[PDB]
């Protein structure tokens, strides 16, 4: 007998047992599928799809650019980005007609967001291509470095503290004739280095996408951020959209649409559902199309708002794609390896590369400028998802029976990457005609539906973004099982996070009681192993075992000690929500209770409120008692800033004089130094008054404060 679990799908329907078709529980440990060759393929295919368009020469970067818009009508089923502006405008007009006032209210909310936002928001992004150092760097450090360079280049609008001010600063920068970059050499002796960038060099650096998929520089974060705010505002008001809702709302949306399309169907109407994916989403979304749709959306609006919203597509339409690290060359005769940076790929012979790479380089050479390829048509992932969703929802909404003028009519959702159409018509001829019309209109707008990945079946069953719908039952596997191991904050934080995630999975993720019990057992075992806090009675001979044994031999109510101190686990489906120290507070021994919770212990540390009893993964919040087991683990570890920690050093010593600064964003008009000076003077005076300070300290403090005053005045 041979075990063959796939045969199980002869009794248990596929949707019911879908958990078996998902191999991994967590991140697979290889993380492969990216490289410079992939970027070459992407550029070549993007320019291939749009090849039939007009070829132009940009006046600033000198790079060639492609314009497929209003191109000749597609004649074949291959993916084509030859979208028509008139058609997208008509589609947006109909969308506004069927949802009057959506564009206007979205614009008002976006205006509010533009006005109130701040610069520091850009420190909340992911890895970012710092143009100043010409490499990837953290969002916070990249922003600090860009601010430093702008300050050294006489651009300090961002000093006001507003994101739009930083955008105006970038505006000033890109029109500058030359940019000066200063760097320090940190060892042995320290020096200085100055570099000068002409207008074209900096312009190219601003419109670059470092590929590691790609990440733009701080130049093009704010404009896309505001366009994303607008798109999110529009989508929040659309029923057919799929963003930015969570797991629970997706099921409701799916059920609503399916019931609406099925029940309204009469006894003489046939219904079908097309579960579909898009051939190549970001490779056929011309930025000009988004500019046209934003122009339509922001009709009759303040000009500043229109321009702030229009910069992002304008910037993206002339963007540059970087070519990563380069290539690796290996010689077997002398077992000699070398790295060739992609910069010289323009002017290197075509004999070290295989046939496929030779074709790639031959196709990409004419489009290569200063080591970066000019990619006008197409787009990159993770930036214009919401606006693309808006366009998809517009074309879907075009299906209303009034527009079609004929019996057939369609509806459904759209989540950018994938979608699920539903078509109603009298006969199968009607269904065919409706699907044909939908397909042709999507092509005209410039959208290609993956014919291979898209299948059509009578209404009742479908899939949508990993949500499997079968006759009303929706199965969720978008994220699959979470990570039940210790997150790795500290003892108490990890315990609370584990119990809380088990509880949340039980409430929302449809997890079972026995499954929750087993998850708790596994988590407690993992915790005990990781933190060397095995039971005081058990002998496992770890580094910590002796002290735990002494503690156990010392106490009396051994059922009260924490897990991390050698105590029994007392959790269950009953009290997953109860913090540990509380859950066994009553049992705690008086002396152990006093020691464990002594607030003068040197092992407790609290950071700013945003990082107190909260962890970043998305983020989740946990409840725990600040005990001796709340310690913080040790930290592990060409720069424009002379001292990378000057800002962190500065904010510290503010918390000292003003502890409230840690809790709430402090507000005041006086500069900081005078604030510390006044607080210190008052504190020293009152300290002398009490009698715990003598004359010498008072004199020293006042001399020091006076000297600081003189130093700051000058």
């Amino acid at each position: 007998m041979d075990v063959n679990p796939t045969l199980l799908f002869l009794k248990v329907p596929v949707q019911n047992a879908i958990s078996t078709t998902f191999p991994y529980t967590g991140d697979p440990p290889y993380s492969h599928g990216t490289g410079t060759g992939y970027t070459m393929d992407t550029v070549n295919r993007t320019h291939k799809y749009s090849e039939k368009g007009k070829w132009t020469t940009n006046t600033e970067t000198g790079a060639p650019q492609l314009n497929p818009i209003d191109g000749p009508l597609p004649e074949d089923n291959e993916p084509s980005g030859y979208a028509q502006t008139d058609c997208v405008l008509e589609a947006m007009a109909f969308l506004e007609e069927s949802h009057p006032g959506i564009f206007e209210n979205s614009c008002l909310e976006t205006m509010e967001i533009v006005q109130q936002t701040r610069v520091d928001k850009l420190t909340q992004g992911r890895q970012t291509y710092d143009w100043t150092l010409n490499r990837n760097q953290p969002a916070a450090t990249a922003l600090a470095n860009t601010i430093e360079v702008f300050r050294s280049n006489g651009l300090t609008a961002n000093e006001s503290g507003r994101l739009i001010d930083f955008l105006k600063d970038v505006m000033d920068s890109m029109d500058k004739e030359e940019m000066e970059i200063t760097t320090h050499f940190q060892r042995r002796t320290i020096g200085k280095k100055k570099q000068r960038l002409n207008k074209r060099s900096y312009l190219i650096r601003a419109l670059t996408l470092n590929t590691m998929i790609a990440t733009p520089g701080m130049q093009i974060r704010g404009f896309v951020y505001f366009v994303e705010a607008l798109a999110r505002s529009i989508c929040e008001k659309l029923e057919q959209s799929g963003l930015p809702v969570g797991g629970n709302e997706k099921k409701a949306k799916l059920a609503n649409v399916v019931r609406k399309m099925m029940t309204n169907s009469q006894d003489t109407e046939l219904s079908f559902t097309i579960t579909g994916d898009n051939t190549k989403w970001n490779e056929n979304q011309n930025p000009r199309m988004f500019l046209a749709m934003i122009t339509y959306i922001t009709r009759n609006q303040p000009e500043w708002f229109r321009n702030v919203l229009s910069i992002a597509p304008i910037m993206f339409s002339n963007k540059m794609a970087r070519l990563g690290k380069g290539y690796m060359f290996e010689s077997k005769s002398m077992k000699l390896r070398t790295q060739v940076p992609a910069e010289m790929l323009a002017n290197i012979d075509l004999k070290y590369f295989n046939k496929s790479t030779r074709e790639k380089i031959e196709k990409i050479r004419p489009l290569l400028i200063d080591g970066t390829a000019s990619l006008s048509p197409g787009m990159m992932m993770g930036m214009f998802n919401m606006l693309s969703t808006v366009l998809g929802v517009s074309i879907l909404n075009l299906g209303q029976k009034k527009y079609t003028k004929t019996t057939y009519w369609w509806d459904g959702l759209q989540s950018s990457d994938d979608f699920a159409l539903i078509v109603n018509a009298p006969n199968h001829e009607g269904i065919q005609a409706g699907v044909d019309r939908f397909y042709r209109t999507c092509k005209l707008v410039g959208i290609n539906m993956s014919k291979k990945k898209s299948y059509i079946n009578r209404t009742g069953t479908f899939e949508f973004t990993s949500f499997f719908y079968r006759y009303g039952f929706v199965a969720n596997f978008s994220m699959e099982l979470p990570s039940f191991g210790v997150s790795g904050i500290n003892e108490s934080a990890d315990m609370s996070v584990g119990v809380t995630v088990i509880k949340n999975n039980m409430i929302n993720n449809d997890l079972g009681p026995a499954t929750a019990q087993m998850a708790l057992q596994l988590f407690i075992k993992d915790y005990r192993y990781t933190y060397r806090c095995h039971r005081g009675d058990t002998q496992i001979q770890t580094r910590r075992a002796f002290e735990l044994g002494k503690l156990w031999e010392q106490t009396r109510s051994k059922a009260g000690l924490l897990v991390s101190d050698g105590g029994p686990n007392l959790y269950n489906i009953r009290n997953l929500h109860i913090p540990e120290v509380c859950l066994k507070w009553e049992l705690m021994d008086e002396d152990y209770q006093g020691r464990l919770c002594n607030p003068m212990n040197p092992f407790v540390s609290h950071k700013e409120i945003d990082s107190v009893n909260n962890a970043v993964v998305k983020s989740m919040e946990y409840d725990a008692v600040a005990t001796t087991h709340s310690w913080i683990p040790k930290r592990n570890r060409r720069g424009i800033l002379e001292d990378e920690q000057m800002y962190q050093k500065c904010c510290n010593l503010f918390e000292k004089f003003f502890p409230s600064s840690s809790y709430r964003r402090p507000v005041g008009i006086s500069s900081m130094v005078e604030a510390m000076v006044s607080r210190a003077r008052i504190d020293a005076r009152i300290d002398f008054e009490s009698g715990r300070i003598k004359k010498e300290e008072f004199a020293e403090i006042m001399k020091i404060c006076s000297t600081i005053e003189e130093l700051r005045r000058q």
């Binding site: 006032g101 610069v119 520091d120 953290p138 600090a144 099921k251 409701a252 609503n256 019931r259 609406k260 309204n264 009303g472 997150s487 904050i489 409430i507 990781t530 806090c533 002290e547 929500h577 109860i578 509380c582 008086e590 152990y592 006093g594 919770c597 003068m600 040197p602 092992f603 609290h606 409840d623 600040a626 310690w631 683990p633 040790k634 930290r635 592990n636 800033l641 000057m646 962190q648 904010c651 010593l653 003003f658 964003r665 402090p666 507000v667 005041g668 008009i669 500069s671 900081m672 005078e674 604030a675 006044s678 607080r679 210190a680 003077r681 008052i682 403090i701 404060c705 600081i708 700051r712």
Partner: protein
């Protein structure tokens, strides 16, 4: 001392001095987000790796004086080292356990007080009651629900103010020192936490957690109270259910009902008034609900009703673009319609002036006991779907939907006069009168409404005119779902227009809300360091600056210099005239109001 010497060191360098003198305290938190470090990806792997080391835990210098270098077994507790970026000495978990087993001991008297929320959870569990499990199909309707019981439902700003006064006594902003209402809770907490050595940041966070409200979108199938949500994992399952009851204390307030009654009275008494807008505004500005002005409650409470919505429209704010008709919250979802005025003759020879919507519109209705959808054409009912726990809920929901449709078929199906008049003896609009009439009796309409067969499919069943399930025949476009329908997921708030008649009109010229739609039911109504006025920037003549905590010694009317906010020295005085900032501008307000009109 250490702090001032460190500040002097910082000032010595050019760049630190420049950043100190340039940046204003307002933007301090902006330069707190400029971190040059690197966030650790996959911290679980990092923790696993770290725990294997000898000294992976960071302690402070003072530890050198209390915990000896080695224990009895000569193990190394703390090492003469420093962390990367500070002077935090390096210690091992052995140090933590040694501290726990042999460290100095104190009294955790304030720990229950600071941590009342968690201990409240403990008590609620410890006194609960369980019951037999039941296995059956579970329907979990999705909705918003509270999270933390025991909260005062204060706004985040108010919670921040309370925390600042409680734990940061001499660092409170200017608003508190120019404030009058010293909340009772603040004094209660100040008395409770007299001698508390707990880290003040921890105390502040715990008070914030305790005094704030939180709401989440969850699928529930049973009790929705806050104490019934914290045990939702234990109570509801996919195929089972658990009988449970918390055994603590519930804090269900009643201010919402009082606000309902107040708004209803205001609208009822202002609709007949000469100038309802200014009149209602004056009332709302001068009315108190249980010791608090109604304006704060209106701005805070998320109530949804016709009276309160019209009050907001008059005052000027955002309200949901929907109406609660017949006890059901409606919401448009798709299509568009145009409002047209017409005269309709009923089956009782009664002429009514009505306004009907023409268009292929779609609505979703969520009631107290049902959920429904309705697709309506131009004066034509196309499709109706309802789902409800009981048959009576089904019937009332369907009656509401059909009267909303305003089709011509039911017009000839009216039997009896429609002369209903509210308790105020004010003529009711035709649609409400029809709604009440069909509530009284609709059998005749059911017999003459419409009957047609329906194909049989899973998940949905028909209804006969006597309101009984059927699979082979039902009413025109009337159907019932055997599974609960999830409520609306979002609501759209748009700018609306209000006329003097308290009718709210949308930007398209249609009307949204009317006082006539308001139910006429009647219910029952269930060393203070404050009072200081600043006198501009610091003045040297008055003497050296004082700390806020020591302001109490000031004589009546004496003016001194005190440090308010996060280091802002200002000249303040005690009050002499027993007034407040509330009554200012009222006289000039009324004067200019008379002038404009």
């Amino acid at each position: 001392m250490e702090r001032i010497k460190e500040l002097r060191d910082l000032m010595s360098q050019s760049r630190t001095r420049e950043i100190l003198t340039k940046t204003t305290v307002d933007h301090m938190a902006i330069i707190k987000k400029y971190t040059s470090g690197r966030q650790e990806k996959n911290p679980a792997l990092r923790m696993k790796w770290m725990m294997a080391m000898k000294y992976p835990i960071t302690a402070d210098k003072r530890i050198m004086e209390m915990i000896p270098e080695r224990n009895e077994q000569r193990q190394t507790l703390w090492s003469k080292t420093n962390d990367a970026g500070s002077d935090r000495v390096m210690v091992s978990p052995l140090a933590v356990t040694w501290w726990n087993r042999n460290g100095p001991t104190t009294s955790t008297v304030h720990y229950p007080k600071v941590y009342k929320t968690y201990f409240e959870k403990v008590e609620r569990l410890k006194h609960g009651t369980f019951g037999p499990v039941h296995f059956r199909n579970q329907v979990k309707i999705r909705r918003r629900v509270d999270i933390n019981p025991g909260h005062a439902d204060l706004s985040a700003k108010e919670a921040q103010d309370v925390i600042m006064e409680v734990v940061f006594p001499n660092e409170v902003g200017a608003r508190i020192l120019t404030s009058e209402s010293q909340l009772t809770i603040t004094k209660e907490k100040k008395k409770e936490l007299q001698d508390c050595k707990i880290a003040p940041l921890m105390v502040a966070y715990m008070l914030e957690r305790e005094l704030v409200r939180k709401t989440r979108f969850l699928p529930v199938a049973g009790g929705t109270s806050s104490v019934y949500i914290e045990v939702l994992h234990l109570t509801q399952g996919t195929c089972w259910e658990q009988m449970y009851t918390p055994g603590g204390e519930v804090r269900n307030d009643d201010v919402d009902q009082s606000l309902i009654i107040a708004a209803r009275n205001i609208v009822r008494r202002a609709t007949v008034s000469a100038d309802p807008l200014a009149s209602l505004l004056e009332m709302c500005h001068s009315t108190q609900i249980g010791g608090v002005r109604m304006v704060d409650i209106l701005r805070q409470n998320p109530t949804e009703e016709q009276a309160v919505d019209i009050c907001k429209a008059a005052m000027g704010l955002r309200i949901s673009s929907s109406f609660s008709f017949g006890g059901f919250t409606f919401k448009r979802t798709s299509g568009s319609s145009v409002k047209r005025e017409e005269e309709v003759l009923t089956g009782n020879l009664q002429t009514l002036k009505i306004r009907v919507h023409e268009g292929y519109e779609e609505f979703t209705m969520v009631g107290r006991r049902a959920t429904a959808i309705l697709r309506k054409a131009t004066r034509r009912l196309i499709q109706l779907i309802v789902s409800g726990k009981d048959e009576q809920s089904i019937a009332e929901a369907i009656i509401v939907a059909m009267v909303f449709s305003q089709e011509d078929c039911m017009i000839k199906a009216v039997r009896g006069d429609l002369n209903f008049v509210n308790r105020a003896n004010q003529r009711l609009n035709p649609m409400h009168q029809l709604l009440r009439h069909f509530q009284k009796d609709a059998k005749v309409l059911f017999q003459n409404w419409g009957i047609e067969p329906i194909d049989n499919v899973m998940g949905m069943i028909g209804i006969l005119p006597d309101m009984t399930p059927s699979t082979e025949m039902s009413l025109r476009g009337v159907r019932v779902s055997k599974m609960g329908v999830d409520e609306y997921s979002s609501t759209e708030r748009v700018v609306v227009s209000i006329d003097r008649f308290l009718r709210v009109r949308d930007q398209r010229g249609n009307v949204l809300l009317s006082p006539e739609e308001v139910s006429e039911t009647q219910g029952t109504e269930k060393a203070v360091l404050r009072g200081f006025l600043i006198l501009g920037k610091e003045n040297k003549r008055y003497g050296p600056a004082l700390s806020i905590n020591e302001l109490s010694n000031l004589a009546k009317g004496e003016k001194a210099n005190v440090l308010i906010g996060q280091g802002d020295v200002v000249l303040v005085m005690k009050r002499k005239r027993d007034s407040s900032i509330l009554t200012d501008s009222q006289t000039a307000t009324k004067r200019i109001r008379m002038a404009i009109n």
